[PDB]
Design a protein around this ligand. Structure first.
Ligand SMILES: C[C@]12CC[C@@H]3c4ccc(O)cc4CC[C@H]3[C@@H]1CC[C@@H]2O
Ligand SMILES: C[C@]12CC[C@@H]3c4ccc(O)cc4CC[C@H]3[C@@H]1CC[C@@H]2O
Lengths: 284, 284
């Protein structure tokens, strides 16, 4: 009962943090369906849930594989309330390394999960929301979906894709009463994030010494930005709640304002020259 | 010999028009490899080539299926000059209709062709260009890759994806001497384009009467813009040549300036509200 919320990718990151934040809310007004690709990773969620003493029945875990429309439909049947008021499309994958070093299947997976996965969720849940004339969909964005970043080619491709998919739907949904918002996250404190970055030899034999040397420089710079600007998951997760509660929500919510100046010079020059130059000088 | 150019998707559209435009150039300085997914569609290309009296040996057709890395590699071996100076990533698919009415495989194909296909081409051809310290890659963009359009959700997703993939690479390639440019096309006179649009019943039984009614309104509006603003393929194809010849090319080349005001109000308001409102009022 209550405001039924369904979130994808709750085994860590803002997803897990958002589920427990909702389920543990003092008002006890949200019933939460935290979905995970592999249930064997539900431990963290439950330990975090017990840590915030979430009332029994405010949090339920479902196995949902966004790469499978059959998994998406089945999970939709498990929603006992037979209604979803807030859908949070959060599941996502990252990809780092020179374009030529990335395996084809890896590239195919990031699009499949990040973009198509979100398409599968919306196809399954959008119809009913339009029929009711109400619903809210929140999508986890990234400033990497607002500007291109070296060595994150395919990652930015998928995030830029969400921006376009969402802006299009938004124009159409305006009259149907269903709201759609993107939460533009900058870097969020994920120790695992700063540890995933770092690939010597394996990358070296699949690229050239000059691209490799550039990858190193990018990694060094990346570590700096993360350290000096990574936000608390609690700060980010709360933005999801600000959007979620806004009577007339905007299409975009920015969790931080530090990256806004770099985005402005990106439009003052539609030819992309200024940006490409500024970003290169700053990263190299 | 000469400036070797390889283009994808030459069975019609700007691709075909660009190949013959290059191969027939008075200076006879371009050797052209026009690739097609199905060779049985090479007729038009050849008839157009004969119409512009292209010298023998200035145009060669190769079957290249961008959805297959095996096809991409094989075609790369057919390049007798053993070098590619200008790669034009043009192959692409469109998709129209309410998100919920689009089949999953159709959505998967547009990303596979438009985005991954471009990834497969760059992985195969980027390395060599970096090793030489020179090369030019031109990618066919769309203003639908710069702003979201109702009923073109997945199409805009794929075009927004190219924008992100390219802006990222650009930042990295700046020092390697290889140039990458996007050609932002508005609508181009394609009779087939205005005839593809239009789907009653089939769409109706896979959506609701209100979305259907909106689809109709969008189609009506789409027909107007095309009629009042579609450009000649010769005008667009020439932009590809302006980029191709620029000593220091920019990241973006716009074939028309009419859509620039609508793009400006899109950044003056990063929350996306103004744009979503303006585009809805204009389209509905
Ligand atoms: C795209 C992200 C936000 C923007 C970050 C940024 C922003 C600007 C910059 O100069 C470098 C970086 C490196 C890490 C990036 C992040 C990686 C994941 C995160 O979502
Ligand atoms: C995205 C395209 C350019 C922009 C066009 C536009 C631009 C603005 C607008 O008000 C409506 C349309 C409808 C058709 C669109 C086109 C469909 C294909 C073309 O590339």
């Amino acid at each position: 009962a209550r405001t039924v919320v369904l979130i994808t990718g709750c085994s860590s990151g803002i997803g897990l943090h958002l589920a427990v934040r909702l389920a543990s809310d003092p008002s006890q007004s949200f019933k939460v369906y935290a979905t995970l690709r592999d249930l064997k990773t539900q431990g963290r969620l439950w330990e975090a849930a017990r840590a915030l003493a979430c009332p029994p029945g405010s949090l339920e875990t479902l196995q949902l594989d966004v790469r499978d429309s059959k998994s998406v439909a089945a999970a939709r049947e498990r929603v006992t309330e037979g209604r979803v008021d807030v859908l949070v499309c959060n599941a996502g994958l990252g990809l780092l390394g020179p374009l030529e070093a990335l395996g084809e299947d890896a590239v195919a997976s990031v699009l499949e999960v990040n973009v198509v996965g979100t398409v599968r969720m919306l196809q399954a849940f959008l119809p009913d929301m339009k029929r009711r004339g109400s619903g809210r969909v929140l999508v986890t964005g990234s400033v990497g979906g607002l500007m291109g970043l070296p060595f994150n080619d395919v990652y930015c491709a998928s995030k830029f894709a969400l921006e376009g998919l969402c802006e299009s739907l938004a124009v159409l949904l305006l009259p149907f009463g269903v709201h759609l918002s993107l939460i533009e996250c900058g870097p969020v404190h994920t120790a695992f994030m700063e540890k995933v970055l770092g690939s010597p030899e394996e990358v070296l034999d699949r690229t050239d010494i000059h691209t490799f040397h550039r990858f190193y420089q990018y990694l060094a710079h990346s570590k700096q930005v993360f350290r000096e600007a990574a936000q608390n998951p609690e700060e980010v997760a709360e933005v999801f709640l600000t959007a979620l509660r806004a009577p007339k929500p905007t299409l975009r919510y920015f969790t931080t304002e530090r990256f806004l100046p770099l985005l402005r010079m990106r439009l003052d020059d539609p030819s992309g020259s200024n940006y490409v130059t500024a970003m290169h000088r700053e990263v190299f």
